[PDB]
Scaffold this active site. Structure first.
Site, mmCIF file in Angstrom:
data_model
loop_
_atom_site.group_PDB
_atom_site.id
_atom_site.type_symbol
_atom_site.label_atom_id
_atom_site.label_comp_id
_atom_site.label_asym_id
_atom_site.label_seq_id
_atom_site.Cartn_x
_atom_site.Cartn_y
_atom_site.Cartn_z
ATOM 1 N N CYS A 71 0.852 -1.180 0.000
ATOM 2 C CA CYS A 71 0.000 0.000 0.000
ATOM 3 C C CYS A 71 0.898 1.243 0.000
ATOM 4 O O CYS A 71 1.843 1.351 -0.779
ATOM 5 C CB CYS A 71 -1.038 -0.090 1.133
ATOM 6 S SG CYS A 71 -2.285 1.085 1.358
ATOM 7 N N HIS A 72 0.629 2.188 0.898
ATOM 8 C CA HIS A 72 1.478 3.374 0.987
ATOM 9 C C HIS A 72 2.842 3.059 1.599
ATOM 10 O O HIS A 72 3.760 3.883 1.505
ATOM 11 C CB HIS A 72 0.788 4.478 1.797
ATOM 12 C CG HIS A 72 -0.407 5.059 1.111
ATOM 13 N ND1 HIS A 72 -1.678 4.550 1.276
ATOM 14 C CD2 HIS A 72 -0.526 6.093 0.242
ATOM 15 C CE1 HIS A 72 -2.526 5.242 0.537
ATOM 16 N NE2 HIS A 72 -1.854 6.186 -0.098
ATOM 17 N N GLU A 117 -6.255 6.302 -4.834
ATOM 18 C CA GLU A 117 -6.094 7.547 -4.074
ATOM 19 C C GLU A 117 -7.199 8.568 -4.413
ATOM 20 O O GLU A 117 -7.700 9.278 -3.540
ATOM 21 C CB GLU A 117 -4.702 8.155 -4.326
ATOM 22 C CG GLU A 117 -4.263 9.128 -3.243
ATOM 23 C CD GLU A 117 -3.834 8.417 -1.957
ATOM 24 O OE1 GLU A 117 -2.649 8.026 -1.874
ATOM 25 O OE2 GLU A 117 -4.669 8.244 -1.038
#
Length: 225
Positions: free
Chosen positions: A132-133, A163
């Site tokens: 993910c991030h 996003e």
């Protein structure tokens, strides 16, 4: 005996807003329980140590493994009183795994300990994982010639599409996807909220929370030859 280091954000505010963020809890807990067994040990750290912030959106829905994790007195105390990344000796570990959550966008990219410890694992061809991030951890990791180690490698991570769907394109400090491309990586993604995992030179990246299971599977397999 294998030894795996899992790393979380310590950043608890969504940019200049008052919105709380931090770790996406299941990106810690689902790979934790998928990987751990009597021959694989997992240690958990955060960037700053102390209380690990949890993005409330990641616990809005009840989840079996999240609850299991939080009910374990040992693991509860990790979340309150975590060890900092700066205080571990990376030599002890066979893999380093970066959990996601939006908090990572503010304290992973420029962290010196992430840079040096990922290099150490990479140099012995250990496993480097990010989801993910959390893939923000890998953007700026450079070798001794200042070249990004993810250049020319196939990666994924939280997509610009995803996003935009969650409405944070203008809140995050940079686009993760765009930054991976700028770093020279070969970025790709699956359709939104679909499980998607890339593996290149034992750098294993995963797109979203829905990728956590297959992410863990890939890591566990890569630990062995």
């Amino acid at each position: 005996m294998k030894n795996v280091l899992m790393v979380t954000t310590s950043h608890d505010v969504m940019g200049n807003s008052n919105e709380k963020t931090g770790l996406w809890l299941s990106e810690l807990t689902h790979p934790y329980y998928s990987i751990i067994d009597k021959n694989i040990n997992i240690d958990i750290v955060s960037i700053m140590g102390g209380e690990i912030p949890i993005d409330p959106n990641s616990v809005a829905q009840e989840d079996y493994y999240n609850d299991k994790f939080l009910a374990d007195d040992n693991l509860k105390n990790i979340m309150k009183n975590s060890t900092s990344l700066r205080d571990v000796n990376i030599k002890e570990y066979d893999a380093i795994i970066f959990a996601g959550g939006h908090g990572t966008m503010w304290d992973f990219p420029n962290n010196a300990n992430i840079h040096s410890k990922v290099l150490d694992i990479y140099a012995k061809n250990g496993v480097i994982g990010a989801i993910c991030h959390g893939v923000a951890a890998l953007i700026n990791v450079k070798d001794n010639n200042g070249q990004n180690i993810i250049r020319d490698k196939e990666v994924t991570g939280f997509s610009n599409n995803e996003e935009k769907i969650v409405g944070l394109t203008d809140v995050v400090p940079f686009s993760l996807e765009d930054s991976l491309v700028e770093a020279g990586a070969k970025y790709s993604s699956a359709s939104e909220w679909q499980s998607y995992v890339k593996s290149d030179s034992k750098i294993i990246t995963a797109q979203n929370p829905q990728s956590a299971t297959d992410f863990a599977k890939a890591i566990k397999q890569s630990l062995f030859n």
